[PDB]
Amino acid sequence: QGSRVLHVVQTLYPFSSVTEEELNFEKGETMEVIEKPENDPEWWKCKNARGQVGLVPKNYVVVLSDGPALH
Amino acid sequence: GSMGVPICGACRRPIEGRVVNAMGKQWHVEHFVCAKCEKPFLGHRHYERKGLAYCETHYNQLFGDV
Ligand SMILES: [Zn+2]
Ligand SMILES: [Zn+2]
């Protein structure tokens, strides 16, 4: 109900986040960016296609799919 | 087979034409804009402040080295 190809993201480093809303993921993890609020830090609510969710520095991953696709 | 493509810090997308090195990063000559009005310097001059781009007037409106 929330995984359309809009902004898929491939990890660049095996980060480690283990909290309530933290995302732990090994490099090579397709994460489905559920939401991208600012809040203050710059983290994003991204689900891991591995089927998990947690906040993660939106700078630790690159974006492949995009909405504005002009030409 | 080492990497070989810049990535616009604006959309985090692999750049592939004319790059703009700012903020110690790379930016699509089209996405590199002022950090106050978003005016791209396709072929114009930009101004940096506190590590953020600013048009000639916004930069100065923001500071202007004074
Ligand atoms: Zn860009
Ligand atoms: Zn400006």
**At residue B58, what are phi and psi to the nearest 5 degrees?**
-65, -45
d(CA A23, CA A26): 10
C-alpha neighbours within 13 Å on the C-beta side of residue B25:
20
Residue A37 near residue A44, CB atoms below 8 Å? yes
Compute CA distances A19 → A54, B7, B29, whole Å.
8, 31, 39
Domain extent, residue B34, equals 1-66
Range of the domain at A22: 1-71
Question: How was this one solved?
Answer: NMR
Note which residues in 34-63 of chain A have CB less than 8 A from chain B.
62-63
Terminal CA-CA length for chain A:
29
Residue of chain A with shortest Cα separation from B7: A62
Q: Contact A49/A29 with Cβ under 8 angstroms? A: yes
Pairing relationship of beta strands B13-14 and A31-35 according to DSSP bridges: unpaired
- Pick the residue from chain B with its C-alpha nearest to A59: B12
Report the amino acid identity of residue B8: C
- CATH code (residue B40): 2.10.110.10
Interface test with A, best of B3, B5, B7, B12 (most A CBs within 10 A): B12
CA distance B16 to chain A (A): 15
Split into its structural domains, chain B has a count of 1
Distance CA B43, CA B63 (A): 23
Interface of B with A in 5-64 (CB under 8 A): 7, 11-13
Asked if B55 and B39 count as a contact pair (C-beta separation under 8 A), the reply is: yes
Which of B28, B36, B31, B30 is closest to B53 using CA atoms? B36
Q: CATH number of the domain at A41, please.
A: 2.30.30.40
Is A66 part of the contact surface with chain B (CB cutoff 8 Å)?
yes
